[PDB]
Coordinates of C-alpha atoms (C1' of nucleotides) and ligand atoms in Angstrom, one line a residue:
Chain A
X1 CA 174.0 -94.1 -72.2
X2 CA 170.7 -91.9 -70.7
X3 CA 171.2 -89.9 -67.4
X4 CA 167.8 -88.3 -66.8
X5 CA 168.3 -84.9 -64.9
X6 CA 165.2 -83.9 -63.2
X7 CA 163.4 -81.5 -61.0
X8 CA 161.2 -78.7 -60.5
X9 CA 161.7 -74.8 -61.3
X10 CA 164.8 -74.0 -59.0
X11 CA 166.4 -77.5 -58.8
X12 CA 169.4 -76.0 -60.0
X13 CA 169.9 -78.3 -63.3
X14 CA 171.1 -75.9 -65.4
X15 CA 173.7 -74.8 -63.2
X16 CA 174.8 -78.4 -62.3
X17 CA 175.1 -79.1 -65.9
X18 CA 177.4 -75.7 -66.7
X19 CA 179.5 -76.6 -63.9
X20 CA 179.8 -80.3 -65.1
X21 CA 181.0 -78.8 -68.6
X22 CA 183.0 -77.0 -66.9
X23 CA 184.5 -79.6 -65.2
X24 CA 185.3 -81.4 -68.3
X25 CA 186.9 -78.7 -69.4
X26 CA 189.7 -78.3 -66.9
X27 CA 190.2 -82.3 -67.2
X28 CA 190.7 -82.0 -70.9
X29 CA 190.5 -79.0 -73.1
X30 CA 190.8 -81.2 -76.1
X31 CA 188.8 -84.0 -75.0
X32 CA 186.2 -85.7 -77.0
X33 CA 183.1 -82.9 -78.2
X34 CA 180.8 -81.7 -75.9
X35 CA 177.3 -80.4 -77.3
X36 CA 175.4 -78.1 -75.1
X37 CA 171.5 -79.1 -76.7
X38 CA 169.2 -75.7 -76.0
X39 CA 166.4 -73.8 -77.0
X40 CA 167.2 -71.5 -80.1
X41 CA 166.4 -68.4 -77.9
X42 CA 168.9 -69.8 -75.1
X43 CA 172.1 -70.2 -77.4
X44 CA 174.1 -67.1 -76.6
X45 CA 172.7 -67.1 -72.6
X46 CA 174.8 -70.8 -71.8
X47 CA 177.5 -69.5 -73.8
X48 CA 177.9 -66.3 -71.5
X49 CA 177.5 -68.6 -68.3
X50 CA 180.0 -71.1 -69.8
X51 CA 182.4 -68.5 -70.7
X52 CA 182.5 -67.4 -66.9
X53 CA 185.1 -69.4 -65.6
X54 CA 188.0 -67.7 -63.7
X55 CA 189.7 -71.3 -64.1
X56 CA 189.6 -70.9 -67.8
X57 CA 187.4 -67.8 -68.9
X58 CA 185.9 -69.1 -72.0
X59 CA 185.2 -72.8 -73.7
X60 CA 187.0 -74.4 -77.3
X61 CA 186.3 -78.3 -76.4
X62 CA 182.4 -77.5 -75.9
X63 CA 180.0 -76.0 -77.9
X64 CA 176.6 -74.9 -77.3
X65 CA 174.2 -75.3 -80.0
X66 CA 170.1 -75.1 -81.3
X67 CA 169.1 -77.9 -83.4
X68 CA 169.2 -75.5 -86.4
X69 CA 173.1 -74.3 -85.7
X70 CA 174.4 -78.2 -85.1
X71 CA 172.5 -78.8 -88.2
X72 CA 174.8 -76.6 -89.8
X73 CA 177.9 -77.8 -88.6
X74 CA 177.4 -81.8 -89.1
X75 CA 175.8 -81.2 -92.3
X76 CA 179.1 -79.0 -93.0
X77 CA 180.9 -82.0 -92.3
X78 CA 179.0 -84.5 -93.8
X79 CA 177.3 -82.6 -96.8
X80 CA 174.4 -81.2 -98.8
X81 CA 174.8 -77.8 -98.0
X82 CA 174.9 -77.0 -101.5
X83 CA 171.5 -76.3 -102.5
X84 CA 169.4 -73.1 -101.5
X85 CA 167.5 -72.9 -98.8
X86 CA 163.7 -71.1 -99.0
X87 CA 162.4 -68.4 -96.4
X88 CA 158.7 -68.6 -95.3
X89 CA 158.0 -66.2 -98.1
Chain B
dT1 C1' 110.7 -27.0 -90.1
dC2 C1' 106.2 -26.6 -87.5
dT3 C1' 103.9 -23.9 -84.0
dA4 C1' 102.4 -19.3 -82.4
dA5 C1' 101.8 -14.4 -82.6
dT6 C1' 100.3 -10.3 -85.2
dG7 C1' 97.3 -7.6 -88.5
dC8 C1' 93.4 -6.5 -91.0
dG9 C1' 88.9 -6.7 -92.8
dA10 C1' 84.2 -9.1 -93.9
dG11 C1' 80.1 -10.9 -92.2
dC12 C1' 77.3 -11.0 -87.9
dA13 C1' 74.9 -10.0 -83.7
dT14 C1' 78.8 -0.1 -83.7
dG15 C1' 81.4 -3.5 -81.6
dC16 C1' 83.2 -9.2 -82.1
dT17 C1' 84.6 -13.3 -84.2
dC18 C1' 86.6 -15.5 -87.5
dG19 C1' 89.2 -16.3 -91.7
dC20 C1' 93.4 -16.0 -93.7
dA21 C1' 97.9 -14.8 -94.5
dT22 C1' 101.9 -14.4 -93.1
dT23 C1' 106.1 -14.2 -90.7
dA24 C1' 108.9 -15.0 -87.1
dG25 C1' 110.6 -17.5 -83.8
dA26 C1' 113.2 -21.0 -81.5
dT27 C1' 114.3 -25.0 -80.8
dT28 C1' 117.3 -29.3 -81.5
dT29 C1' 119.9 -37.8 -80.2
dT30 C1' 120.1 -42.0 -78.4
dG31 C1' 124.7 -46.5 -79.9
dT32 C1' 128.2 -51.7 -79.1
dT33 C1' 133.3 -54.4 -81.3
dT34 C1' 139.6 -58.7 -81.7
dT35 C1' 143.4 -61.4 -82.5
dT36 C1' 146.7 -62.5 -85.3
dT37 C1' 151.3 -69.4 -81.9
dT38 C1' 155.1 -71.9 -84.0
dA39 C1' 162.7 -72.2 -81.0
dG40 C1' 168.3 -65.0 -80.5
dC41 C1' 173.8 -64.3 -83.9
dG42 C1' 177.6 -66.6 -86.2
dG43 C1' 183.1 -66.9 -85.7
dT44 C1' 185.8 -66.7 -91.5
dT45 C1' 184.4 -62.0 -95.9
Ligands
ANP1 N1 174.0 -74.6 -55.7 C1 173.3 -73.5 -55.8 N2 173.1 -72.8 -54.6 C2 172.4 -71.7 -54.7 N3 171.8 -71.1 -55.8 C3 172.0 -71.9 -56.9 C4 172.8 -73.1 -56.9 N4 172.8 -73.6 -58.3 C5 172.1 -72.7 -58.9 N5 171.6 -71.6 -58.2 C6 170.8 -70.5 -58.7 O1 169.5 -71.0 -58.9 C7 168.9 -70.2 -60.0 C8 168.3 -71.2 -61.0 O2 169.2 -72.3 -61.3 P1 168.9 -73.3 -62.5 O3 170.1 -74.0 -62.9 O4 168.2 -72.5 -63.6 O5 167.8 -74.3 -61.9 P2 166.7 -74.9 -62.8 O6 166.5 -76.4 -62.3 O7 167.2 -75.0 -64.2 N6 165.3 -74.1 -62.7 P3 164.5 -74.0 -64.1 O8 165.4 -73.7 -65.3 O9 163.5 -72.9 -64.0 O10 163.7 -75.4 -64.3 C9 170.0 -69.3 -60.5 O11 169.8 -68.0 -60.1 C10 171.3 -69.9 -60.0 O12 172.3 -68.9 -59.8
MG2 MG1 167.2 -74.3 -66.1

DNA sequence: TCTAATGCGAGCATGCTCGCATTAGATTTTGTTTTTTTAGCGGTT
């Protein structure tokens, strides 16, 4: 299922959708995996912010990743990490 | 580097221009023209 979250600058969607993590982490800290999609320069920011919790002060059920770091960690799971990768150069 | 002043003598109409040579001075720039894109680390050695 979709849920389509939307609004203007200063809705407050980023904040509902931490706290809703958040959330789901006091129900179950083992739950089923929850991926936290952002922008590669916005990884370690959501982290911080979900980390700040005085219920639980830090996150293990979710994640948050870029597209290029849950890349790594399905494609550890599933394979074909083997071969090198190339730089721009 | 070219323009101006100084000196001297020959031809002309004893004093005057003119030729020539030469040096010495001073006098002196302006201008303007771009952006290049494209998604932070890494826990464990
Ligand atoms: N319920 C709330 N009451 C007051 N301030 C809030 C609330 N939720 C969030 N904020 C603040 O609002 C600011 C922006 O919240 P945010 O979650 O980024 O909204 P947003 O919809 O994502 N805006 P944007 O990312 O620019 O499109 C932050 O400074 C939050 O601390
Ligand atoms: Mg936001």
């Amino acid at each position: 299922g979709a849920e389509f979250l939307v609004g203007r600058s200063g809705s407050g969607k980023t904040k509902l959708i931490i706290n809703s993590i958040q959330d789901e982490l006091r129900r179950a800290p083992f739950g089923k995996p929850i991926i936290f999609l952002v922008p590669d320069q916005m990884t370690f920011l959501m982290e911080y912010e979900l980390a700040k919790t005085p219920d639980m002060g830090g996150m293990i059920r979710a994640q948050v990743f870029s597209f290029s770091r849950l890349a790594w960690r399905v494609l550890q799971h599933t394979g074909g990490m083997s071969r090198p990768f190339l730089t721009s150069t």
